[PDB]
Design an enzyme around this catalytic site. Structure first.
Site, PDB file in Angstrom:
ATOM      1  N   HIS A 118     -13.277   7.228  -2.138  1.00  0.00           N
ATOM      2  CA  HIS A 118     -12.067   6.718  -1.477  1.00  0.00           C
ATOM      3  C   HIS A 118     -12.008   7.214  -0.047  1.00  0.00           C
ATOM      4  O   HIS A 118     -12.412   8.350   0.246  1.00  0.00           O
ATOM      5  CB  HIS A 118     -10.812   7.002  -2.350  1.00  0.00           C
ATOM      6  CG  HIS A 118      -9.866   8.046  -1.845  1.00  0.00           C
ATOM      7  ND1 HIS A 118      -9.614   9.201  -2.552  1.00  0.00           N
ATOM      8  CD2 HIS A 118      -9.013   8.062  -0.794  1.00  0.00           C
ATOM      9  CE1 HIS A 118      -8.704   9.920  -1.919  1.00  0.00           C
ATOM     10  NE2 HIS A 118      -8.324   9.253  -0.846  1.00  0.00           N
ATOM     11  N   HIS A 157     -15.647   0.063   3.487  1.00  0.00           N
ATOM     12  CA  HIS A 157     -15.475   1.048   4.550  1.00  0.00           C
ATOM     13  C   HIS A 157     -16.720   1.352   5.352  1.00  0.00           C
ATOM     14  O   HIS A 157     -16.638   2.155   6.274  1.00  0.00           O
ATOM     15  CB  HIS A 157     -14.941   2.351   3.966  1.00  0.00           C
ATOM     16  CG  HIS A 157     -13.613   2.201   3.309  1.00  0.00           C
ATOM     17  ND1 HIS A 157     -12.516   1.696   3.976  1.00  0.00           N
ATOM     18  CD2 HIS A 157     -13.200   2.481   2.055  1.00  0.00           C
ATOM     19  CE1 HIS A 157     -11.483   1.674   3.153  1.00  0.00           C
ATOM     20  NE2 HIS A 157     -11.870   2.139   1.982  1.00  0.00           N
ATOM     21  N   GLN A 180      -4.476  -3.430   4.873  1.00  0.00           N
ATOM     22  CA  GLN A 180      -5.065  -2.659   5.930  1.00  0.00           C
ATOM     23  C   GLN A 180      -6.450  -2.254   5.496  1.00  0.00           C
ATOM     24  O   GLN A 180      -6.646  -2.080   4.379  1.00  0.00           O
ATOM     25  CB  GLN A 180      -4.268  -1.381   6.179  1.00  0.00           C
ATOM     26  CG  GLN A 180      -4.068  -0.517   4.943  1.00  0.00           C
ATOM     27  CD  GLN A 180      -5.202   0.488   4.698  1.00  0.00           C
ATOM     28  OE1 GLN A 180      -5.909   0.857   5.612  1.00  0.00           O
ATOM     29  NE2 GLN A 180      -5.369   0.908   3.452  1.00  0.00           N
ATOM     30  N   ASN A 181      -7.367  -2.107   6.439  1.00  0.00           N
ATOM     31  CA  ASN A 181      -8.695  -1.603   6.113  1.00  0.00           C
ATOM     32  C   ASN A 181      -9.402  -1.037   7.315  1.00  0.00           C
ATOM     33  O   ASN A 181      -9.435  -1.651   8.357  1.00  0.00           O
ATOM     34  CB  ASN A 181      -9.572  -2.699   5.520  1.00  0.00           C
ATOM     35  CG  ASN A 181     -10.885  -2.156   5.000  1.00  0.00           C
ATOM     36  OD1 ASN A 181     -10.901  -1.414   4.021  1.00  0.00           O
ATOM     37  ND2 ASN A 181     -11.990  -2.527   5.649  1.00  0.00           N
ATOM     38  N   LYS A 185      -6.161  -7.772   1.450  1.00  0.00           N
ATOM     39  CA  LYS A 185      -5.883  -6.361   1.673  1.00  0.00           C
ATOM     40  C   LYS A 185      -5.006  -6.159   2.920  1.00  0.00           C
ATOM     41  O   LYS A 185      -5.220  -6.782   3.968  1.00  0.00           O
ATOM     42  CB  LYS A 185      -7.209  -5.582   1.794  1.00  0.00           C
ATOM     43  CG  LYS A 185      -7.112  -4.117   1.363  1.00  0.00           C
ATOM     44  CD  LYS A 185      -8.389  -3.325   1.684  1.00  0.00           C
ATOM     45  CE  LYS A 185      -8.117  -1.825   1.542  1.00  0.00           C
ATOM     46  NZ  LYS A 185      -9.270  -0.919   1.885  1.00  0.00           N
TER      47      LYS A 185
END
Ligand SMILES: [Fe+3]
Ligand SMILES: [Fe+3]
Ligand SMILES: [Fe+3]
EC number: 3.1.27.-
Lengths: 134, 134, 133, 133
Positions: B129, B16, B41-42, B39
């Site tokens: 997170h 992120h 979505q990111n 993955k």
């Protein structure tokens, strides 16, 4: 990866075969119970395992989402389905996953392979992944 | 779950935090290299780890995607970001994952916790997170 | 095996160490890639080139994988450090404790064609340590 | 542990079996939840109720988890079947082979407050087998 207690075909059936699924937020619980985190998207094909096995016998074509693979098979007919999209992808566990419902009727494309030793001997070739719907 | 070689905070940073990410299909390779599957979505926050640690010191609020949790923290300012969406979710491995690019500028909400023993002692509280962006 | 590694790369990490420290130290680099302490691990005190040469030896059935026939036994005994987990009831990798069992044994490795990500200069590489004798 | 199980449920699956078959058979039900053969496993020939009662015994430091103090030792030795993996070089769970080591030992379990998914009728439950003596 998949839960080791299941073959690829068994995990395919749990994820992608449901004749009369409830609302996605309910229907997805059965899948996410076996996971640490919620699945982001999932399509339920409203059909039977036997029917998908028959599609595995159709002509071999390129997998649209795996273009180096040519062990995919497209259904001859559109089938009713329920697509589920995770509304809260920030969810840290599976206790609270919420899904949006997307009903539809589309052709499906599955990749098929030889069965696993733990798979039933009734079907020597089985679906192992839902590649896409059209 | 996450690769065991990383703490939650280290894996947060890899997913992120990227000040100048390339196109998503390229940028996501760094994340998916550590995974068996792509993955879905990111979001890359175009900021620094230190800056997100500072947001962890903001007032504790409810996590929008985890509504039983109240260890979330919202940025005071909108930050540039790059969101990545998987175009071919039927991909069976990470060799061929293609992503759509969504640039933007939004507030972010992170969950923060006490650091892991393997985390640097510089930051006793760290982001663990990315809950959502607003 | 962490997916970022080929089987040969992971083989080398686990099983090739010319001069390993005491087991409790040596095992930390392996267990950092794991959720739980590895119960046993043998470090062969050798080089990757030595093991690749063993891959050229007579192929044999794999003693611990009897349906496989791509195993190879070392012609000689090689120095090694075997590590045995002292506290297998450990619930995480925070304090894995190992007993040191130095030795010299034959080893049997399975060898396969290189992974596309492997160096192109070794067409056949060790991919798993089947057993030691 | 498969996420669909609580720690107590997984404890019972791995470690409570009143009359287990030979190890190579008994271990199949555990290894089906795994990618690789478990290296060692003790089946306590007991009942879940017996173990819950041990959770009421004097709390002690966990021998294999020394930062934890929620362990409990059985007052008596209990019949058990210990299973040792014969072929730890096995690359999958297709043919895990075990040596049978029947015995009678004290056991030490860690006990914790029940999981919300656990039965509400046992407030404290075994959650891991720390060691046997
Ligand atoms: Fe995921
Ligand atoms: Fe996934
Ligand atoms: Fe293991």
């Amino acid at each position: 990866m998949r839960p080791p207690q299941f073959t690829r075909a068994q995990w395919f059936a749990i994820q992608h075969i449901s004749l009369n699924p409830p609302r996605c937020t309910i229907a997805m619980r059965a899948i996410n119970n076996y996971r640490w985190r919620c699945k982001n998207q999932n399509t339920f094909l409203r059909t039977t395992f036997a029917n998908v096995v028959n599609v595995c016998g159709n002509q071999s074509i390129r997998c649209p989402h795996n273009r180096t693979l040519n062990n995919c098979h497209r259904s001859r007919f559109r089938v009713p389905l329920l697509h589920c999209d995770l509304i809260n992808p920030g969810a840290q566990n599976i206790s609270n996953c919420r899904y949006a419902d997307r009903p539809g009727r589309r052709f499906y494309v599955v990749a098929c392979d030889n069965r696993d030793p733990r798979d039933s001997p009734r079907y020597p070739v089985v679906p192992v992944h839902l590649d896409t719907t059209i």
